[PDB]
Design a protein around this ligand. Structure first.
Ligand SMILES: Nc1ncnc2c1ncn2[C@@H]1O[C@H](COP(=O)(O)OP(=O)(O)O)[C@@H](O)[C@H]1O
Ligand SMILES: Nc1ncnc2c1ncn2[C@@H]1O[C@H](COP(=O)(O)OP(=O)(O)O)[C@@H](O)[C@H]1O
Lengths: 343, 216, 216, 344
């Protein structure tokens, strides 16, 4: 649906040149949920705008549904923008309208028969579970409830694409669950191409099929979710995976931690597990086989896109010949073993 | 307590009202369009001419600076060339309209800068015309501030209307002037004062309450 | 222009600065403590009086709701009793400040209300007394706010003092009323206009210069 | 005991309805110690702390600081009292009008002090907090932490015996809250300053607190020492908070599968408490070899609270009906608390 090619944008502000995005190219396969993760000022907000041209790229190419959006009549670009729905962090609804009317607005803009907008709005409202809430104002609604109105309104046009700007960025984790679950059931049911940006790796997990990772206005990794969570290529990606998995090496350890082996030391290890590795009784096997003691300082395990992964920080008590033997055994079994230092 | 007298004084109550609202009305006719022109023309906004906003905001300002009587007096030749007269309300609502308009527009602009941008953004992404944004989004969203604007416009105009008595615009203010500044009949001066105080409150209770009803 | 006129203007320019600035001062000596004591009495504040507030708040609203000219005229007896005159430069100042106090007090409290309540809390926590908290904390914090109000008050007082020249406060307002209305010289009116506009821009520009001077 | 709160009960009438903020809350902060009060938002933390200061009036109870009674006292007495209790706040509460320097000095001005000590006292307290560079700056210029240093130095101006903290690190980022808390920590150790503390963040508690009360709905549910609360938590809620500080996430997919009703081909999912004795003891590695169990670790963390090691594990245990029953029992003997969350 979305193919952005070599897209770069420079802002004109303050006698200062900023790169919001630099040589950015992104294909999103029709039918798929595609995340973009990065940091504040990393250039994602700029980017997601570039799709429906809420921002004009200083160079590069946007095309949606085969149609290049860069050179367009402002009157053709409205018609173009019918096929791209959008939603926002702060939900952006008219306080002056009800749930119903708020959804009917985009239908109003490009003129639709009184009954057709009734049909459409009323349908999209049950779809989002707001058919109960028809007459309410945004005053009386939940951040989630609002974001559901926001969704229904995005789909009024019946588009081929749904843009999400930090769409969950402020929400109940519980409710963040419900809205992403809903975006998903729309992907699956309706074949709606979805592109979203976030700083939250947790949403990237939940509904994304692919994920890009972006810095200094360039996105360095483009892969599947499975790949990136399990086999992060860039240290920065790893760091993000240290957000999702919470791995805390306690503070007493760093002062306690030795760069090289000292007499009567045991090694400290970072063990990274992948897929089947993760359900394996690998450490309990090493207890018996190599007569070693694994002490676990920290361990987390997580699903990302149908592949399990996990990391744990452990001590290993044993011989030099026993320890060197479990570690190898572990490696042969595809635990990644990294020796952090000594305790 | 003259039945002769009371009826003129009660003709006066009509004199303010006509003067207050007809000006208020025409003020907005000019004030409201000019106000959206300012807003949308500001740097971040839709049309965004910083050169056009500099001009219009200047016109707006120098007019707001002129105190009202000085504007009322200075305006007589023009008031006349317009109405053909000078004394009397139908002439007074000329300088009373020009008194309000610039004062209004700045309220409009300020009332539009009140609504969160990015309803504009949400809005643009839907294929929204600039017209459509103003009409379909901006104005309806600003409304409780548009009504609060008029309550202030109107209440301001009553007092403006009364400065016209000294210049013989012929309203409750003129009765206070003639009888207060010269005659000092004590019952009419007490009555004119309370009448007007009463008129401010009614203007505000009406608007103050009608705002309550328009919000959400 | 006649040389006896140029010299007459220069009285008014003075008689205007006189009235406006003096009225201002007295109006703050009053509205300021009124404002402060309007802020405190609200629910939740240092001394919370439901009823004391209501009384002081209604009366300021009453006083504020009387169009100045009507205030002045209704005040004729007051003025003479206190001044010994209803006429002139210093007579003007009585009504002119009574007309300023409600503006000022309302503004002062609205300025105080800009200050985050946790500042009070810090202050009581240090063992600071309700007087200490005002002069040591609250006022300093709204100084930009308050200086803004002063600007806005003095300007208001110009228009007020000008309308005083219909009722013989003298000043540039008197000069306009006579030579723009009673009988007309184009030149004299036109330099009355222009003088007044400049007095306002100067009053505005200066205030902003002070407010822009307070640390962020 | 430096500060003593006794049967403190505070009620409010806001609406038609009447909420009870605090019910018979009692706690003693021994001098030279750092005391945390943790709880959910709306438990009465903010009220509780305030009473000590009589920024709030306890409906009934006793408030005793440095031995000196507060509740019934003369407002002119309450000032000199307040010279003994410094306070800092979540929203830093600095005068925007004053320099970091003078901001500190204001409490010194409240009672009249010669300009000479002020220059002295303030320069000192600023070198303490690490702001000495910044004497001439305005708070709008400061970053979040810098503001809290100022606020701290300011609360320390009167050279108080007791420092109170109202969610004091709550708006800072993880990085700064570490540096603020450790700065407070020093002052406690170096100057022996007594600290009362309120947080919603258990992390704040396990970093610098010696003692900890868990408060829930105006009530104190668990009062013990930090060492004692993070090790052998006596309350489910207590466990909830602790279980939080160490970030322990049982993925949705597990909670969905977990069922307290046991089935066929099922293994128990159980959560394990380790205290300092059992933390470094290789009780799981042993337990495999001995009882021929497979230990599957779903997540686990070890930490330190109050100079004491501890930790928690969610694991599933793979073995024979007997083998499983056996090794569980061997962990219980070794001071692992074994608690079975279901079968899977
Ligand atoms: N309209 C604009 N004008 C000027 N600068 C901007 C504008 N929009 C964004 N920027 C700046 O350029 C960078 C673009 O990144 P952005 O799209 O905001 O990514 P993020 O969503 O991660 O903040 C930001 O650091 C921002 O400060
Ligand atoms: N000044 C007040 N007026 C009315 N109700 C209050 C007031 N202070 C607290 N409450 C109520 O009592 C509860 C006391 O909690 P609070 O003092 O805010 O501590 P916490 O940090 O646990 O929320 C609050 O949840 C609130 O509902």
């Amino acid at each position: 649906m979305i193919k952005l090619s070599n897209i770069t944008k420079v802002f004109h502000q303050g006698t200062r040149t900023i790169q919001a995005l630099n040589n950015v190219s992104l294909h999103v396969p029709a039918g798929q949920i595609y995340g973009v993760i990065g940091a504040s000022g990393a250039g994602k907000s700029t980017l997601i705008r570039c799709v429906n041209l809420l921002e004009r790229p200083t160079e590069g190419s946007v095309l949606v549904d085969g149609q290049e959006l860069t050179t367009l009549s402002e009157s053709e670009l409205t018609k173009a923008r019918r096929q791209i729905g959008m939603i926002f962090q702060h939900f952006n609804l008219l306080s002056s309208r009800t749930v119903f009317g708020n959804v009917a607005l985009p239908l109003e803009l490009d003129n639709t028969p009184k009954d057709e907008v009734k049909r459409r709005v009323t349908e999209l409202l049950s779809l989002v579970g707001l058919g109960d809430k028809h007459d309410s104002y945004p005053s009386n609604l939940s951040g989630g409830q609002k974001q559901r109105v926001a969704i229904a309104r995005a789909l009024a046009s019946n588009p081929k694409v749904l843009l999400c700007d930090q769409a969950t960025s402020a929400l109940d984790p519980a409710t963040t669950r419900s809205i992403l679950e809903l975006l998903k059931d729309i992907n699956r049911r309706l074949g709606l191409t979805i592109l979203l940006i976030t700083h939250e790796m947790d949403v990237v997990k939940r509904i994304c099929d692919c994920v890009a990772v972006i810095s200094n206005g360039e996105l360095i990794e483009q892969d599947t979710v499975s790949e990136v969570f399990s086999h992060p290529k860039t240290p920065l990606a790893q760091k993000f995976i240290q957000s999702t998995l919470h791995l805390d090496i306690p503070e007493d350890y760093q002062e306690r931690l030795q760069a090289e082996p000292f007499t009567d030391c045991v090694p400290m290890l970072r063990l990274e597990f992948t897929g089947q590795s993760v359900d394996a009784p690998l450490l309990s096997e090493t207890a018996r086989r190599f007569n070693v003691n694994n002490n676990i300082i920290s361990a987390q395990m997580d699903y990302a896109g149908g592949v399990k992964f996990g990391i744990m920080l452990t001590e290993m008590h044993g011989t030099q010949q026993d320890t060197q033997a479990a570690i190898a055994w572990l490696q042969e079994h595809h635990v990644k073993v990294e020796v952090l230092g000594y305790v | 307590m003259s039945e002769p007298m009371m009826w003129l004084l009660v003709r006066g109550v009509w004199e303010t009202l006509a003067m207050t609202f007809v000006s208020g009305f025409f003020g907005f006719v000019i004030g409201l369009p000019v106000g959206v022109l300012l807003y949308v023309t500001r740097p971040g906004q839709i049309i965004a001419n910083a050169k056009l906003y500099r001009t219009v905001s200047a016109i707006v300002n120098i007019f707001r600076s002129i105190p009202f009587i000085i504007l009322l007096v200075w305006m007589i030749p023009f008031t006349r060339v317009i109405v053909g007269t000078s004394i009397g309300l139908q002439a007074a609502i000329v300088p009373l309209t020009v008194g309000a308009a610039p004062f209004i527009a700045r309220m409009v602009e300020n009332a539009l800068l009140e609504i969160p941008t990015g309803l504009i953004e949400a809005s643009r992404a839907m294929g929204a015309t600039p017209m459509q944004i103003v009409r379909k989004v901006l104005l309806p969203e600003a409304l409780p501030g548009l009504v609060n604007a008029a309550t202030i416009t109107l209440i301001t105009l009553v007092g403006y209307s009364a400065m016209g008595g000294a210049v013989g615009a012929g309203g409750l203010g003129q009765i206070g002037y003639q009888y207060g500044y010269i005659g000092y009949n004590a019952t009419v001066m007490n009555t004119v004062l309370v009448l007007l105080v009463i008129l401010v409150y009614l203007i505000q209770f009406a608007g103050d309450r009608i705002v309550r009803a328009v919000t959400r």
